[PDB]
Amino acid sequence: EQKVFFKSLDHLGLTFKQADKKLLTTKQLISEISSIKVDQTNKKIHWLTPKPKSQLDFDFPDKNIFYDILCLADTFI
DNA sequence: GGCGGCCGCTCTAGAACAGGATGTATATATCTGACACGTGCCTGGAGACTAGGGAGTAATCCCCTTGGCGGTTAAAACGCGGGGGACAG
């Protein structure tokens, strides 16, 4: 049970090995950005003619994270 | 007065049933011929010993089969039409 219980508690993590392969592809990200684009456009068509130019934004509060993927990258090299 | 319907009568046949037929199942009588016991060996395995070598086990290693995915087009499966053949006769 020391190896059974914690693996049983992981639900999305067991399928993460295949979900990350299937979902972090080019066409999936194209679909997920075009969905937000058409949502913004028809929501503004319903509401107001000007459209915002900002969608799917990320915040970067920590500067050492770039250093971390740099370390992972030249470890993989 | 004629004719269809109904019921009784005789004819015919399927089939259960009993008797004869002939090749085996048994009940002794007796032969008989290998069966197993006894005897006499004697020839091969067991106690004991010498020596050694191939596997039991440990370690490594690298290898290769199992799980585990999407993808995609070959194909299993469901179903309709029908068609020629398995089988009863």
CB-strand contact A14/B, under 7 Å: no
* Alpha helix positions (H), A1-77: 5-9, 16-23, 26-47, 64-76
CB of A63 closer than 8 Å to CB of A74 = no
CB-strand contact A15/B, under 7 Å: yes
| Resolution as reported, in Å | 2.9
CB of A36 closer than 8 Å to CB of A51 = no
Long-range residue pairs from A38-45, CB within 8 A, at least 24 positions apart, any chain: none
In this complex, the nucleotide whose C1' atom is nearest to the CA atom of residue A25 is B70
CB of A42 closer than 8 Å to CB of A51 = no
Q: How many CB atoms lie within 10 A of CB A41?
A: 11
CB of A36 closer than 8 Å to CB of A56 = yes
B67 C1' – A56 CA distance, angstroms? Answer: 37
CB of A19 closer than 8 Å to CB of A12 = yes
Q: What was the structure determination method?
A: cryo-EM
Dist. CA A57–CA A54, nearest whole Å: 7
Distance of CA A65 to the CA centre of its chain: 16
CB of A57 closer than 8 Å to CB of A36 = no
B62 C1' – A77 CA distance, angstroms? Answer: 25
Which residues have C-beta within 8 Å of that of residue A33, sequence separation ≥ 6? A55, A56
Q: Which residue has the tokens 């770039």?
A: A66
CB of A38 closer than 8 Å to CB of A45 = no
B87 C1' – A71 CA distance, angstroms? Answer: 83
